[PDB]
Amino acid sequence: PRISRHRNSSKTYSTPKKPFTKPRLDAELKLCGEYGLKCKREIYRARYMLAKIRRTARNLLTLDENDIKRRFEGAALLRRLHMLGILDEEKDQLDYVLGLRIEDIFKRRLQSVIVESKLAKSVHHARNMIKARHISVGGQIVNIPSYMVRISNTSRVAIADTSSLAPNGKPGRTKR
Amino acid sequence: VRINVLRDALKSICNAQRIGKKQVIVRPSSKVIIEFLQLMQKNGYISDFAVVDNHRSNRIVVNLIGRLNKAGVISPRFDIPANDIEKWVVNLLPSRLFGHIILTTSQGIMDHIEAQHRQIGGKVIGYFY
Amino acid sequence: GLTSAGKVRKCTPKKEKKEKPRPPRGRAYKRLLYNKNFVDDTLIHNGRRLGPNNLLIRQKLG
Amino acid sequence: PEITVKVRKVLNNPLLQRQQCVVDVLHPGCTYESKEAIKAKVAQQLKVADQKNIVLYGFKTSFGGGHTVGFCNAYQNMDALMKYEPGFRKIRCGLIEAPKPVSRKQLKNLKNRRLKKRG
Amino acid sequence: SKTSGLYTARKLRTVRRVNRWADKKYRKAHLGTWLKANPLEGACMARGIVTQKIGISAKQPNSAVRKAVRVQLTKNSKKITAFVPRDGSITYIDNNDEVLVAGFGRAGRAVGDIPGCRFKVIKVAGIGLLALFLRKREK
RNA sequence: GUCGCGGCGCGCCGAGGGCCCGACGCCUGGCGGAGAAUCAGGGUUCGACUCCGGAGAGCGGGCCUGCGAGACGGCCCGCACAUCCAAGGACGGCAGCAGGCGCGGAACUUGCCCAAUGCGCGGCGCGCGAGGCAGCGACGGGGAGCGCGCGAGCGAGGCGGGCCCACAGCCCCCGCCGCGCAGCCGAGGGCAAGGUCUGUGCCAGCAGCCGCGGUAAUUCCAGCUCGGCGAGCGUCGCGCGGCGCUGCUGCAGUUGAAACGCCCGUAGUUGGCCCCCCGCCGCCACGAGGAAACGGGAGCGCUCCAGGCAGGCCCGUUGGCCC
């Protein structure tokens, strides 16, 4: 009854076991300073995505080589991590997936990519520009600062053609 | 009564090593004791061992090289599924790289690594690390 | 006893709230918390790091 | 600004005498002012040349993008269109006059009242 | 010592079932004497009409008059003693005016200097007690 | 006798049958499973609900029709409780969907519509409170805001068009005006954050716990400042983890809780060594065959995402494979 019931849903964040650890409160604030994050949930999501990927890597490393699952599932984890750019292209092994940080999840995010391309003066600048849809990846405008681009789309990231090139010519304050 | 022949043997070897005794004697000799010790001799943890014949259960004079750290038995011998071997190695042995778990298999008494290569599992006789 | 109830609450003289400016919200507030705590090294620094509500940090910032 | 129309996965359907096509409306920096405006270009690709015999539907704009993915039912003839078309989508074409259904509850109340008095 | 025989699973299963009861927590979770005894009867909270406003003394070494109301729960006609929390909050609660009572937070044990009050008022006459204290809604 | 087998029933004959590997009796705020919650591993707890099988339409019975119902949106009857009455009679059955009443801590609109997805009948098509759509709805899950910066920019709106739709609407696209906007709990310790200034003076209160309050209150009542998390945060109840405080992994018993006063002894559990080569067992591996969803998991940019099974001129494009 109601196909809505059959639609799935999941939690994408994992709160810390201890919430008031001073070393782990300060480090999260630094990781909000360099990445322009609104709330700690965004860092928790980053650790949930990394932990799952690391758990796949650890359950495959324990498995013997030439066991078919290690060859197939491991190649699919590596390919995904290479396509996103989380895994450096040169490493090409399962062990290097275990030795990764949430810095690699954050770097692929669009807000950090715009600063690297020098389009954004800061990460705080980029967040506002993406909310104002001034950024297009591969010809598609994005409004999400956690879009996370793939290595191929890195070059195709550009200022939205219809936004800051002034095709409108009367944008916001200029109009009036 | 003497329910486990192997437990008394590996205890009498560990006690001898702690004293620093080079050679020890095991009062009852079994075929499974010889197979467990043979595995330790092919792993370098033991030295030459000689089964004297008393015309009864037989004795074993075991030579040691200080190399063995711990030798024990899992009782009752629980049959281990192939995918369960690693879970046993993560608790019973220190380090995934060193140690040995000796399991009786249909192929024969073998270490966990040999069983993993043949992709079969079996009842655990004991462990030597 | 029950008749003398809430005696400190009635006794307390009503105190007026300061009309402070609206604070930055969301990412901007996080930026200011990061700025004060790690960057600058002036607001919480007496030549050494100090606690946010420290009496030395107060008076210096008012 | 210009509108360019490409049809993809055109399938002949002599069963219902129609051509099932996927119309792609690419309008970068501008908007197609209704399906009727771009009907001529899709009709040209089909070669039907009759805008009326084309039924455009499921037109979905993508977020930000000029691209709009839509579908066409290019019937061979108007007569076939009438025989095999959802009546509402013929009214939405503006091709047929609107028939008016009564309230479903009012229709079922009268049914029940008829049954109450000698079936 | 424990029993370790390949066929002694039945004994271990029986021993665990028998010795599980020694813990008070397993008994206060499965015996069911608690469910019948509790005036909340396993509910998150209950509703009930005020009968008496009582001044309860604090336990030593604390010397104070905690303020509470005796409440007969509509659900099981069972009179409980519930502390009314915060300062001057009792003035909001009249007699016979209906109160929603939840437990203190020790899962049915009396908490703090207050003795025997396992419950506290959360809503008076449909109005949250904390709101009447912060003066968000009037009585 | 039944559709048929059968103590199913009866007549007759015999005395069996089930049990500490728990029979039987009682009790269950007891539907079961696929599953779910929490979690290193081993585990624990819950299984009203989506799919599957069972059961029941106030409660007992009984029946007819049919291929199939012991059918309740069929009937007959007894009880309990309605309903109308011109007093003779008639007449029900929301554990369908709205909606009410009662009860409780707690739970949505007497909305619309057969257009999709099915099914009943019928080649040209209707019927459906199945199901779909809208409303309500901080159950919860997910994605963005509350500025960037130093002069430019949005989106929240509104208003139009388009799109969408059974009809609207939302989303999204496009013009036009344009109007960012935070709580809830804390600051003695646990546990992050004032040895600030009043009031109060074992009072009032606070405080899960330890503790503060009796005149220099780091604990109350306000102001101030500050921390945490965040469009959510606090409280209560309960499950899991915590808890090797239930111990299979993995607990303890000289003295902290705890070896039965002793001995025999059945059930139970446990039993040395020995034969390579054989049959039965358990055992391990690998197959068959048995619903998906779910949980993984291949591949695919719903703008990201939770999702979904899509897509794009493509393996016979897919949707593998596992449980």
Side-chain angles (χ1 to χ4, degrees), chain B residues 100-123:
Chain B
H100 285 97
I101 281 184
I102 294 310
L103 51 116
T104 184
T105 345
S106 329
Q107 329 239 347
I109 332 226
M110 280 144 40
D111 48 292
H112 66 287
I113 329 167
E114 188 76 19
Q116 218 86 63
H117 116 78
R118 303 193 201 187
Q119 296 185 354
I120 27 87
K123 328 181 66 63

Side-chain angles (χ1 to χ4, degrees), chain B residues 28-46:
Chain B
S29 160
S30 100
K31 277 182 314 171
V32 192
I33 295 203
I34 298 169
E35 266 73 283
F36 199 102
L37 291 179
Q38 168 204 354
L39 253 296
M40 308 209 310
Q41 213 184 30
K42 301 305 123 54
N43 288 315
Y45 281 84
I46 205 213

Side-chain angles (χ1 to χ4, degrees), chain B residues 2-3 5 29-31 79 81-82 87 120-121:
Chain B
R2 210 155 191 175
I3 317 284
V5 62
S29 160
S30 100
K31 277 182 314 171
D79 31 84
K87 263 168 290 308
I120 27 87

Side-chain angles (χ1 to χ4, degrees), chain E residues 2 19 23 25 44 62-63 65-67 86-87 113:
Chain E
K2 292 147 102 299
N19 299 47
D23 197 2
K25 293 179 179 179
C44 315
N62 289 346
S63 168
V65 182
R66 315 258 70 94
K67 313 288 201 293
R86 288 305 184 184
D87 196 14
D113 55 15

Side-chain angles (χ1 to χ4, degrees), chain D residues 3-22:
Chain D
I3 339 269
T4 55
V5 163
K6 186 253 302 180
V7 288
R8 190 178 65 254
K9 213 194 184 60
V10 189
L11 177 66
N12 65 311
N13 197 221
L15 293 99
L16 270 359
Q17 303 287 328
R18 66 178 170 187
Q19 301 295 301
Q20 297 135 326
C21 38
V22 178

